[PDB]
């Protein structure tokens, strides 16, 4: 069941004594006219605070259970009134599922209303008053016990009548102390417009007039991002699907620059025999981008494919192609037996078998000098102890899987202190208009309401500005259409009211608003809500603007007429 907590749940936030003062404080209070969950056993959360109340007759209700896990293996606060006193414990007790160990703190101390407030260290406020279904009226809860137990609490339960629970919320209240220091009344600063007016005036009565209380702001709904359409993509079909590949010693190198570096082709293509990345993720390549992309394409045998990697040694890793110890790129190699192997053995691809010194990374040596393996200089004779380093490859279709040719392409990224123009695609959502959006076009970020504009930009212009150097219009990069930008409506809130000595019925005016962003009268001052519009004209009672004056008259309600000049 649910019940309406009229005015209860108000406590003293401090010790200090204030006499005849309307103090305004922000703390966790029970919101006025809230919904108290009526029970009559179950456990409950302890998010930020509780207004546990009760309506006992002969001490039917006994105590409270607190903690996180509500059982052993975790500390749990414990308060029960066993007809003698309240025993407070913080030991990891073994509570049953329905009652009625490493201790760190211990303490042994329907016409009733035992109102209690609990919040965390742990503080308890209590006030017992006779009553006659929460009663209407006001009573403050003086603090009764404070306990320095410091237990993390999230749930609570009850022992054992009327058994209500309220929840505390961080709301600002205006507390009416009396001459003796007793809080005799309070105002919730967010219950309704009249309560806001009382809070902003720091008074429990308000005289006739129009008072500005708060600022109304339209918040954006969705973010929009638009970037120019996909331009010319980087060349990846003339490299990965080229007709003829180069020999490994004379590996074909191509520098990719000034284009969009889409990698999607290397992702959907499932025919790659190897896609391995070093230093960077195989998928996070599009995010970070550099000046140039280098494609090194050549053909080797399957037995030496594993040698295309940093820290590799072999007939290929040091005589035909070497990778640095640290590498910024990825290697891709796929079987090309049907493209590089012919009948009778394909011997059109070569490699280097003899070399004086290991090749420096990213160095190509096409020299075909005669190697001197012994001590007799050759002088280009190709005889005993003199060899031709350019060994051919035995590529035939009848080779095994490992002896078939493999087309290898290596991608290297180099970044220096220079403009970088080679990256992936950017975001580009659908265009929405007539709504306060958080736009971000090709470079500029702002909040506004885009509308189909009327200005005629120049061919090369992408921006719009006013005299105050404020962004006004934008040309959409995808569809070359100019858009007007108007900030989404803002302004102030004013509460038009006759005196509380007369009534508590107020009318709210939103300044400079078209009534579509908040019985509803639209004026030049703004959207007037809660005031009738009369076709008569009387003397001005409460000014509004542009000749509109609202007044409280005949039952009786608040009207909004156009004032008469005598």
């Amino acid at each position: 069941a649910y019940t309406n907590s009229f005015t209860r749940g108000v406590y003293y936030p401090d010790k200090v004594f204030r006499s005849s003062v309307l103090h305004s404080t922000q703390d966790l209070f029970l919101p006025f006219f809230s919904n108290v969950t009526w029970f009559h056993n179950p456990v409950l959360p302890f998010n930020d605070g509780v207004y546990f109340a009760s309506t006992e007759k002969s001490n039917i209700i006994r105590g409270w259970i607190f903690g996180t896990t509500l059982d052993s293996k975790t500390q749990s606060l414990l308060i029960v009134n066993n007809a003698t006193n309240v025993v407070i414990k913080v030991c990891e007790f073994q509570f049953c599922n329905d009652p009625f160990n490493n201790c760190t703190f211990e303490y042994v101390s329907f016409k009733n209303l035992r109102e209690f407030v609990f919040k965390n260290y742990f503080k308890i406020y209590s006030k017992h008053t006779p009553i006659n279904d929460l009663p209407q009226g006001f009573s403050a809860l003086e603090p009764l016990v404070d306990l320095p137990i410091g237990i993390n609490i999230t749930r609570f339960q009850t022992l054992l009548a009327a058994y209500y629970v309220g929840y505390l919320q961080p709301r600002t209240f205006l507390l009416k102390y009396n001459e003796n220091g007793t809080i005799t009344d309070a105002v919730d600063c967010a219950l309704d417009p009249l309560s806001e007016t009382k809070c902003t005036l720091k008074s429990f009565t308000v005289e006739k007039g129009i008072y500005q209380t708060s600022n109304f702001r339209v918040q954006p709904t969705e973010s929009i991002v638009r970037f120019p359409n996909i331009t010319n993509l980087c060349p990846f079909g003339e490299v990965f699907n080229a007709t003829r590949f180069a020999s490994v010693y004379a590996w074909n190198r191509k520098r990719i620059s000034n284009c969009v570096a889409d990698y999607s082709v290397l992702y959907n293509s499932a025919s790659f025999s190897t896609f391995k990345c070093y230093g960077v993720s195989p998928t996070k390549l599009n995010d970070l981008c550099f000046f140039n992309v280098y494609a090194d394409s050549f053909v080797i045998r399957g037995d030496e494919v594993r040698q295309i990697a940093p820290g590799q040694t072999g007939k290929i890793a040091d005589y035909n192609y070497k990778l640095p110890d640290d590498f910024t790129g990825c290697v891709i190699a796929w079987n090309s037996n049907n493209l590089d192997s012919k009948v009778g053995g394909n011997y059109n691809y070569l490699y280097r078998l003899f070399r004086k010194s290991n090749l420096k990374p990213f160095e190509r040596d096409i020299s075909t000098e005669i190697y001197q393996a012994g001590s007799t200089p050759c002088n280009g004779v190709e005889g005993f102890n003199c060899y031709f380093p350019l060994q051919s490859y035995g590529f035939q279709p009848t080779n095994g899987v490992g002896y078939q040719p493999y087309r290898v392409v290596v991608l290297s990224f180099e970044l220096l202190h220079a403009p970088a123009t080679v990256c992936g695609p950017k975001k580009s959502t659908n265009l929405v208009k007539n709504k306060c959006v958080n736009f971000n076009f090709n470079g500029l970020t702002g909040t506004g309401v885009l509308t189909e504009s009327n200005k005629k930009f120049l061919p090369f212009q992408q921006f719009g500005r006013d005299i105050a150097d404020t962004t006004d219009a934008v040309r959409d990069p995808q569809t070359l259409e100019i858009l007007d930008i108007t900030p989404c409506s803002f302004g102030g809130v004013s509460v038009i009211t006759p005196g509380t000595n007369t009534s508590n019925e107020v009318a709210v005016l939103y300044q400079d608003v078209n009534c579509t962003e908040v019985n509803v009268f639209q004026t030049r001052a703004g959207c007037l809500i809660g005031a009738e519009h009369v076709n008569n004209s009387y003397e001005c009672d409460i000014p509004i603007g542009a000749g509109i004056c609202a007044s409280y008259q005949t039952s009786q309600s608040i009207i909004a007429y156009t004032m008469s000049l005598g």
Epitope: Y267, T274, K276, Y278, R306, P310, C330
Partner: nanobody, 119 residues
């Protein structure tokens, strides 16, 4: 090369912790994985961890259950289980490689392989 620890009979619902220690690798510029062996059937992939542990993936039949981690201070990484279904009882193999691959599910893309955990 890759010495691994952990494994044993479980209570069919508890938790277990597996480790794989590299004894001859720098472990700071290498990427590992976890693969599963079942008799009478092919080799299965389960888990994978990148450099440091900021980019990790998991199998579709194991996602959300097991957690992977690595730490360079001891040249080893930790795999912790949380469900241990009576269907995942199999042979555990620790792999490693210099880099990370797009075809990270393929067994051929892990040159280094460790010993086996108890079935």
């Amino acid at each position: 090369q890759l010495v691994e620890s952990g494994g044993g009979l479980v209570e069919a619902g508890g938790s277990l912790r597996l480790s794989c220690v590299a004894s001859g690798l720098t472990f700071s510029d290498y990427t590992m994985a976890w693969f599963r062996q079942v008799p009478g059937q092919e080799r299965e992939f389960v888990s994978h961890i990148g450099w440091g542990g900021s980019e990790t993936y998991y199998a579709d039949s194991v996602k959300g259950r097991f957690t992977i981690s690595r730490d360079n201070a001891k040249n080893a990484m930790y795999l912790q289980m949380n469900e241990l279904k009576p269907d995942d009882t199999a042979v555990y193999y620790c792999a490693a490689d210099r880099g990370s691959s797009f075809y990270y599910v393929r067994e051929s893309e892990y040159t280094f392989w460790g010993q086996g955990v108890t079935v």
